[PDB]
Design a protein around this ligand. Structure first.
Ligand code: HEC
Ligand code: HEC
Lengths: 126, 126
């Protein structure tokens, strides 16, 4: 769907921006600094679920640029393992949110955050 | 969810970027220049549905900036009518996509595009 590689870069960066907001806005809830409303979090995690499927198709052939490392493309199976494992972590977060289980939500939130960081550490330029 | 107004601006602009990609990528399909796969379009319109609910909460009190006009805030009911009507247009597009009805999809796509443009014309700086 991208006319030029720059359009793929713009897309995936914007997807990252929105994920960071929908993930990070739950930090005060996880920490107990903001109240836990199960329905609010369930709805927010649904949005995050949708968003977290979006970046990967915007690292398609010929879309090199931005702060994306070339090893994303030269090690395609490995990058794919990381995005699939991340999306698995999001499924765990969705299950916790859908159950209304705050302890499960805390734990799953931490594992999602670790998955974001692990990919950025390997595949995003500093 | 925004620490500063600049964070709300960044969010709503990124939501616009993603909407433009998920809407605009269907232009060749509507025109018949690309094939129509009902399931592919149904899934894409679902993504667009989710995205098209997102900008409005990022024009909250104190979030003035970017290319957003002040009348967004001073005429709150009117701006709200436009975003609600736009989301209604997206419901029509979803119904067309879910039905697998290409004629309905063409018509609904045009009405969605007109709704994007009408809001930008009134509320986005040139
Ligand atoms: C690899 C499997 C990733 C996972 C998991 C997550 N992110 Fe990511 N992100 C990744 C790359 C390779 C890039 C660079 C894209 C480019 O071309 O520049 C990014 C970028 C971001 C950004 C910055 C966007 C920008 O302003 O330029 C953000 C804010 C971001 N990513 C957030 C984010 C979050 C919150 C994640 C987990 C919920 C997450 N990413 C996972 C690769 C990967
Ligand atoms: C009002 C009810 C709007 C409707 C309907 C749509 N958009 Fe919009 N959009 C609106 C404003 C006020 C702004 C400016 C935001 C700011 O603070 O700068 C925008 C911006 C965009 C952008 C530009 C993002 C950027 O790169 O800075 C895009 C690409 C965009 N909008 C796309 C878009 C599409 C495709 C829409 C219909 C599917 C749509 N917008 C509707 C206000 C409104």
């Amino acid at each position: 769907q991208f006319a030029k590689p720059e359009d793929a870069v713009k897309y995936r960066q914007s997807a990252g921006t929105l994920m960071a907001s929908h993930f990070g806005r739950m930090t005060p809830v996880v920490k107990g600094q903001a109240p836990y409303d199960a329905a609010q979090i369930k709805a927010n995690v649904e949005v995050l679920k949708t968003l977290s499927a979006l970046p990967w198709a915007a690292f398609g052939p010929g879309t090199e640029g931005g702060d994306a490392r070339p090893e994303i493309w030269s090690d395609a199976a490995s990058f794919k393992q990381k995005q699939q494992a991340f999306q698995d972590n999001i499924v765990k977060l969705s299950a916790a949110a859908d159950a209304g289980d705050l302890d499960k939500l805390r734990a799953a939130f931490g594992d999602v955050g670790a998955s974001c960081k692990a990919c950025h550490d390997a595949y995003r330029k500093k």
